[PDB]
Design a protein around this ligand. Structure first.
Ligand SMILES: *[C@@H]1O[C@H](CO)[C@@H](O)[C@H](O)[C@H]1NC(C)=O
Lengths: 377, 41, 339, 49, 50
């Protein structure tokens, strides 16, 4: 249960057993020492995603099971040529099968067989959600250049009409610059002009130019108020291949990014990235909870872990203050599988059953129950 | 549910309170005018 | 390739790539081949080379505000009732001059000046009644302009065209309309996946009349507005949705199964090839191939902002102005003639 | 003059001079510009929802 | 003049796009609401016993 795929609830206090949703998992953990053969037998009942997959596999394949939970290990790291954890229990002919989070790779596939991956898992970054500000070019956005150039040419031809007005009837001359200033002012709500002398064509002519100024200006304001609202989108980083990680010092005060040491992600990074691993070690962090707390207080700029755990953490976070650029840009995208015994005969059947689950569409339902959260929108 | 995406126009009745206000203001203006006329008598 | 009944005989035989791999005409399949359940019965698929899903692909549309006129947010009765309303107020301001306590032409010029926000006109009413009348008329030229602008900018805000299809649970996809042609590539994994479902099969009856003979022809027909939605893998749709700048994937992947090199059920190559692919996914070789071939972007960010007003929808006011100049010339002949 | 300055303009005659007078009408115009761009925003936000 | 008007038209579109997007929240609907299947600590809500 070190992963959010299987959970552990001790037992319903109503009937002394568990409901028909979970399956009884025997938490057979050696508690104190090897002084006695007592495995600390307390019958719990595990449930979740891997539990549902396992329960679907047994009905689609006729077999029974009994969950010997774990003893002295988490996933299995080769130490002195000896495997521990799930891989250690499988390789010693004591388990014959393993489930949960195995993160299939070459070292585990060397001595332990594997089925087809039922879920993807790689290396995804987790950053905070940058607030989306308005574009720097937005005032000159809600009106195309065509509208501006016509308005200008209409201003020019109305000035021509005003200079033609000079041959009107009997009723400081009304020059071209004065009319231009008067019409330039009348479209930006007012400056301080001196107007037509009289002459009903002149006053009328400025009055219908004012009616096109009132519509043009109450239409720009409406269009500006309709863009400012809808458009909002931004992205902090593009992934591990962006220049933000390859060149940390070539920026503003540099970013800070680190993972949990002594793991799989740290091992790959160190194997395929020297300077990246060095910079990550220069900013090492504690467990996933402490890493989330550090991301919440603005101390770390990017967290590095597996895709599934980070997605689950971001789905159920308080509000939606977390992001995971992730998605298509995930590095070393491995999968989780069911560690069958080496050279066993159930491997083909179990992988065919997994592919058949995949075929009809039940794993999507399982994901929508156990892998989505509040920020699914 | 019933979506509020409606391009509502401003018909001759959807926005008419301003005209009632204008009529009441005209009535008050006539009252003030007749009061001033009585005062000027 | 898929399973299909032959035209004449009784036994069922595979098609295309599957048939050529099984019937001793090919020892390997180096191509994008989505791992399935109907194919793993006779084929031994290695560990997947790249992960992907099934996503829809629709054409990007122009926002197209469609304003079509300026008196658009007023209803032709309100535009006419306001005009006689200027004059009634103008003739009332003029009539409130003969009685003791302004010139009638000028008082009607002043109502036109106070509601068109123009600066023309000179003189203000001197009687208290006409002063209060103008004082409340100012309040009404401004309620008409502030109300015309909030109505124009609440119909320009709610002018969203539509909501594109998302995922597979969209009710418009489970039961589509007649004029909503959308299909897939015949004989593929999507075909079997849709033929396997229950209600998606009731919709798959409808897709089945037209399915393109290949993905390339479908991508070509989508641009020509002949196909409304194309459901395919997403590694090929992501490359189509980037180069052309008019194709965008709307839905989310709902069938997570990647391709894989597949050789026949008995060969030594099957064991060493799964280790080469697992070992070369880890030391970033696949990442190098992806950066070299699959992902070089040329169009993105999905702005989806509302429409900018063009000269095709805002030409009514220019027609009104041009019209103002033409009537102005006839008015100048009347002024000379009246003078 | 102040009634006009809040409904965007009528036709007034203003302060004679005197820096307190012109200033005084000028800061009344600054409360008229905010009051009127706030009613319009509030009217545009009701008409929508 | 063109810039006194861009400042006032811009101050009003920003004021009326923050007065439009000022929705308080979205109340619980039905039973499939994710906030109900896993509620927060300070979200006390209960029913009538028995
Ligand atoms: C985004 O706005 C919220 C509003 O309270 C604020 O708390 C947060 O710090 C902002 N984030 C950024 C990156 O500006």
């Amino acid at each position: 249960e070190e992963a959010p795929f299987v959970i552990v609830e001790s037992v319903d206090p109503l009937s002394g057993t568990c409901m028909r949703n979970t399956v009884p998992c025997q938490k057979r953990i050696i508690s104190e020492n090897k002084t006695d053969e007592e495995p600390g037998y307390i019958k719990k009942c595990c449930k979740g995603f891997c539990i549902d997959i396992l329960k679907k596999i047994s009905k689609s394949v006729k077999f029974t099971y009994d969950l010997y939970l774990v003893t002295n290990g988490k996933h299995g790291k080769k130490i002195n040529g000896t495997w521990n954890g799930m891989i250690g229990e499988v390789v010693m002919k004591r388990a014959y099968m393993a489930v949960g989070s195995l993160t299939i790779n070459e070292e585990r596939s060397e001595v332990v067989d594997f089925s087809v991956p039922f879920i993807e898992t790689g290396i995804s970054v987790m950053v905070s959600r940058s607030n989306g500000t308005v574009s720097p070019s937005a005032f000159l956005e809600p009106f195309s250049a065509c509208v501006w150039v016509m308005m200008f040419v209409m201003l020019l031809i109305v000035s021509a009409v005003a200079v033609f007005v000079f041959e009107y009837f009997s009723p400081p001359s009304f020059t071209i610059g004065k009319a231009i200033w008067l019409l330039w002012g009348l479209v930006f709500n007012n400056s301080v002009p001196v107007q037509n002398p009289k002459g009903t064509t002149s006053k009328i002519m400025v009055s219908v130019w004012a009616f096109f100024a009132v519509i043009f200006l109450a239409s720009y304001t409406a269009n500006l108020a309709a863009f400012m609202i809808q458009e909002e989108y931004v992205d902090q980083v593009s992934g591990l291949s962006d220049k933000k990680f390859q060149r940390p010092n070539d920026f503003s005060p540099p970013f800070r990014f680190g993972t949990v040491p002594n793991g799989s992600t740290e091992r790959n990074i160190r194997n395929n990235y020297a300077e990246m691993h060095a910079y990550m070690g220069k900013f090492n962090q504690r467990g996933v909870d402490d890493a989330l707390l550090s991301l919440k207080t603005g101390k770390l700029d990017a967290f590095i872990y597996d895709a599934a755990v980070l997605n689950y953490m971001a789905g159920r976070d308080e509000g939606c203050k977390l992001v995971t650029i992730g998605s298509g840009k995930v590095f070393a995208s491995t999968g989780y599988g069911i560690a069958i015994q080496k050279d066993s005969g159930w491997k083909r059947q179990v992988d065919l059953a997994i592919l058949q689950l995949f075929g009809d569409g039940e794993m999507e339902e399982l994901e929508a129950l156990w892998l989505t959260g509040i920020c699914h929108n | 549910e019933k979506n509020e995406v409606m391009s509502s126009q401003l018909d001759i009745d959807n926005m008419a309170g301003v005209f009632y206000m204008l009529g009441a203001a005209m009535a008050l203006s006539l009252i003030t005018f007749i009061s001033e006329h009585l005062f000027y008598w | 390739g898929t399973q299909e009944r032959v035209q004449n005989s009784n036994k069922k035989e595979w098609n295309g790539m599957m048939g050529e791999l099984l019937s001793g005409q090919a020892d390997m399949i180096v191509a994008p081949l989505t791992i399935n359940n109907e194919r793993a019965q006779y084929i031994e698929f290695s560990k997947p080379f790249k992960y992907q899903g099934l996503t829809i692909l629709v054409k990007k549309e122009i926002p197209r505000s469609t304003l079509d006129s300026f008196m658009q947010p007023f209803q032709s009765t309100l535009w006419l009732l306001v005009g006689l309303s200027v004059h009634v107020v103008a003739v009332m301001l003029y009539l409130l001059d003969r009685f003791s306590p302004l010139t009638l032409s000028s008082a009607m010029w002043f109502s036109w000046g106070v509601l068109l926000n123009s600066g023309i006109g000179e003189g203000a009413p001197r009687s208290f009644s006409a002063r209060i009348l103008g004082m409340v008329w100012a309040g009404f030229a401004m309620i008409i302009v502030a109300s015309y602008t909030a109505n124009l900018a609440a119909f320009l805000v709610l002018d969203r065209p539509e909501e594109r299809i998302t995922g597979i649970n969209d009710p418009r996809l489970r039961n589509p309309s007649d004029k909503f042609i959308y299909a897939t590539v015949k004989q593929s994994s999507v075909d079997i996946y849709f033929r396997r479902q229950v209600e998606l099969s009731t919709m798959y009856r409808h897709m089945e009349k037209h399915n393109y003979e290949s993905a390339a022809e479908a991508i070509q027909a989508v641009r020509d507005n002949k196909l409304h939605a194309f459901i395919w893998d997403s590694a090929v749709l992501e490359f189509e949705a980037s180069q052309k700048c008019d194709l965008v994937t709307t839905g989310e992947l709902f069938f997570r199964s990647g391709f894989g090199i597949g050789m026949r059920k008995d060969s030594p190559w099957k064991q060493q090839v799964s280790l080469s692919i697992l070992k070369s996914h880890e030391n970033g070789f696949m990442e190098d191939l992806d950066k070299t071939w699959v992902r070089y972007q040329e169009c993105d960010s999905r702005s989806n902002a509302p429409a900018t007003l063009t000269c095709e929808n805002m030409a009514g006011v220019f027609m009104l102005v041009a019209g103002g100049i033409v009537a102005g010339i006839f008015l100048i002949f009347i002024e000379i003639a009246y003078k």
